[PDB]
């Protein structure tokens, strides 16, 4: 029905939308920017991460879709060949729906921000030392000194998360995972060290300990935050939707990805 | 109701043991150790895995207790100062079960054998190199060329897959953790290197390249097996059954267990 | 002859500092904190670090002392109750010598500058995506991407070093090692993952991709560098010497700060 | 001089050797398997280590050189196409020598036993827990519980410990360097996690805590030792001499082996 089309503006991809268009014009199909029902992002993984966040208010109502203009990318999982084949199948419809789960970022302060995630929430310190109490359904966990602490969604595991040696989760799985960045552990100091997978319901509160300034990053988005109290994580109700068109399954998207293509 | 107590052998064990037995004596409670509705583990956490898999064709119809009398187990998470007080709470009955998800491992041969596993079940080689290849839900995912593979249950995370630097996972999850033992990566030789969680019925077969002997354990349990054409890992329908008396979370357990206590 | 003492500057390490300057004036010792031949530190590592940094221009003619008023430090490795003892054996003089090996980083734009690190230097990019070709002796080694580089002394090794995977080498070894933050790792990008331990006299070359600005800290110094382009890391011919007075051995050092004390 | 040639035994290796031998025939080169002093290994790095350890009593008088008629390999560095090359550059001699540091193992037991690596030793248990209190210079370090250690040479870190977390150290560095497998740390039992890079004349002790039965591996060679009182490390006297006829750096066959070819 109504669709619009993001693209990371070099030429390749500008000329891929309006071609897209150009054949979407021959359906009945109303681009429309405002109240899509579908998303295509034309690009790589940033790209998709923007059409995700340009349309975080209206994902009960849109199912996404990602072409990879470039290398394959975990979100933009088509080939710009298959344009014509996606813009063919778009328009008759009856596409099956998957869902993925996101994180819910909450920040409290002296006020309250909430954040979605499809990737990941990050915390770092503002220049000085990172220390805070984290928190697991109010029962203090641990006493975390390092560089900060990175927060995954499933489908986000294979990206920061991977590189802090995180988890791959598939993504049918409902839940968060959170990775430690650089911690001092010593006598007198001790974290867990481990990744940490949470299911849905159960609440990551992370509460400052001297400095309540943080350096917050959501997806791309970074932002420092003054005069923190909590910082709070949980798995979200809300998901985001892919209209899929064939099988791409999770593990051989990790297969084609991390060891050959 | 009927009931039986292990004990890991020592002194203390059996002694508290003896004790527990004539305070149920006081209470409807028979002792059975043949079809028990309520198994009591006193020792360590491979005491409980004794016991587990002593009775585990009867796991639908048993509550598992476990009291450590050496330091804090993660199954045997009972002080032997609270024997008394559980004996009256076991007698009148009235508990919460918990359920703990458990793994299922199949060994085909050239004849097939499963077993159960509460913590994991691992895959070296008889003793020349060990190479496999890792196939999930009918797809090649890699040749894995190592010392070996661990696939653990959520319960499992914080043991063996916890040295080798999986993710500690909650048992309200169901799912298996995959973890590498000491992988080669080269130029010809490419593995994920992250751990991997997989949800309910996905299968992960691990099969043969060239050696087809190895060895397998199921939580303490080591056996040389010959002729394998392939090693089949799933999450299992079966989970084991706790009874619960009072609040000890799993993080708090984690916590009290590699933080401080 | 000529020292001065470096304070924390709370109330326990300026007491200490005025009764050990008493007890020195019973001594042919003099307070000259301009060309010192002795420098005490009071307070913790971060405290022997800037003193090491007041005076690193004169590193062949100063030997240093550390003394712990906190916990134990891996510089300051001296209690507060054997500091009249100190006092005593400093005063008579005779004490043997043990040099450490420095860290050299140099900072060429578009000019030069050059730093001396005791425990390590690290580069993070300005705020988005950390580039950088990896020149080990004018080869092309890699192409980073990741949050960062950290290049150690062996003593440093039990520092930033240690959080980040490094191995823990002997401060006899002349060497230097680098470490990697959070690097990225997939079909297309390629990094070599494990520390690299160079002699002397390799020198480690990092040179720009794309944006040239980059965070360089030197120690616990950190400032933002503008139009890199080269940072060159070799061990350093200058050594810094500190006053022995009893065998307390490396590895030791070790065990007490992360084993047990 | 006095030549001897080894072959991994398939076709493409034998074949290269009798060709090399014929060319040999046309210089004042003499076939010599008893005292050679240039052994030429042809096949992959196995191949080349069993070649040293075929002549390690006779390392002062002896060059070593690799071919590699698989892939790339750190030991062998040569190409089967410049065999006719080498021949003839190696007729004539003028060649430089260059040295690697070799590793130095002493098993003693209730007699005495030693060994020498190129690559690694490594200790394992005999079936059972894995339980070693390490002893650096008669210092008690750490009480080791896990799957066991290895302790490698500089040329060994891109080996098995390599795929253990270890550094990669340069060769040129007279070090050994010791990396945990799998190790358990919790409330009580406290291992120091990192590699440890040891120098010249530092003694590692492995000492039993009960069962005494140990797997020790020396390079590919592995063999049950029973009554183990002390497993003994240190840097070797002796070294590994290679001939070396043109530059291939250490960097560089690194990057060529994990980065790119
Ligand atoms: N260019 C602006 C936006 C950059 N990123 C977009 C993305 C992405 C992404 N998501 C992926 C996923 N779920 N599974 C596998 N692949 C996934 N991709 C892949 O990651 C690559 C791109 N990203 C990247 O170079 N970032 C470095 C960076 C640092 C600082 C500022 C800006 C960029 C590409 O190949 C794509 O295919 C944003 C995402 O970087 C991830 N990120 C951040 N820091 C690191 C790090 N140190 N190591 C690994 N990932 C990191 C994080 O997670 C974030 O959401
Ligand atoms: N003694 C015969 C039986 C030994 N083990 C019983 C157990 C256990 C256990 N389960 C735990 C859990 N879910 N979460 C946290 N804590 C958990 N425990 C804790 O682990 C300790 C005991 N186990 C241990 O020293 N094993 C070494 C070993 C090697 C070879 C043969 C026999 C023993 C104790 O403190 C207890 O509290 C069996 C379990 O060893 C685990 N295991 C095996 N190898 C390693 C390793 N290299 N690193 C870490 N764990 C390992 C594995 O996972 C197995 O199921
Ligand atoms: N307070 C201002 C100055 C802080 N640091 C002083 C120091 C130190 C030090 N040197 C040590 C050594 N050679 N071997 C073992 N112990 C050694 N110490 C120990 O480290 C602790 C102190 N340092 C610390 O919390 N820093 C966190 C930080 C982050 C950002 C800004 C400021 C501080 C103390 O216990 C002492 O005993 C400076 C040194 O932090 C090291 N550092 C930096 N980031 C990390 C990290 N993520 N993980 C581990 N270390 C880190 C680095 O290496 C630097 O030179
Ligand atoms: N085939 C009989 C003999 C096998 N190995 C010969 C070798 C070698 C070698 N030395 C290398 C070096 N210094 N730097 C980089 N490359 C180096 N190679 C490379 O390693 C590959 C070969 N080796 C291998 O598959 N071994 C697995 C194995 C396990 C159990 C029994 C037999 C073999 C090849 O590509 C070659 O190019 C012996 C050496 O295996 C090393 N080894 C042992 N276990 C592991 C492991 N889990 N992970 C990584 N290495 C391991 C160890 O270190 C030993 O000395």
């Excluded at 294979?158 to 993504?171: D, E, F, I, Q, R």
């Excluded at 997978?197 to 420092?224: A, G, R």
């Excluded at 909590?230 to 099988?247: G, L, P, T």
């Amino acid at each position: 029905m109504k669709y619009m089309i993001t693209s990371k503006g070099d030429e390749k991809s500008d000329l891929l939308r309006l071609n897209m268009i150009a054949g979407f014009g021959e359906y009945d199909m109303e681009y429309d920017d405002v109240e899509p029902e579908i998303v295509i992002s034309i690009g790589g993984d940033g790209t998709f991460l923007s059409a995700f966040h340009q349309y975080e208010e209206r994902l009960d109502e849109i199912a996404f879709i990602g072409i990879h203009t470039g290398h394959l990318g975990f979100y933009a999982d088509w080939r710009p060949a298959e344009a014509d084949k996606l813009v063919k199948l778009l328009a008759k419809g009856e596409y099956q729906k998957v869902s993925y789960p996101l994180l819910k970022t909450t920040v409290k302060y002296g006020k309250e921000a909430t954040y979605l995630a499809l990737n990941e929430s990050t915390v770092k310190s503002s220049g000085g030392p990172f220390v805070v109490d984290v928190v697991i359904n109010d029962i203090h966990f641990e006493r975390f000194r390092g560089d900060g602490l990175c927060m995954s969604t499933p489908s986000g595991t294979t990206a920061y998360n991977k590189s802090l040696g995180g988890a791959l989760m598939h993504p049918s799985i409902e839940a968060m995972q959170l990775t430690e960045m650089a911690s001092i552990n010593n006598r007198v100091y001790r974290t867990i060290g481990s990744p940490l997978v949470f299911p849905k319901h159960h609440v990551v509160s992370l509460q400052p300990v001297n400095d309540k300034d943080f350096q917050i990053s959501v997806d791309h988005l970074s932002i420092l935050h003054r005069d923190v109290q909590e910082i709070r994580y949980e798995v979200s109700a809300k998901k985001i939707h892919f209209a899929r068109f064939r099988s791409f399954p999770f593990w051989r998207r990790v297969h084609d990805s991390f060891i050959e293509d």
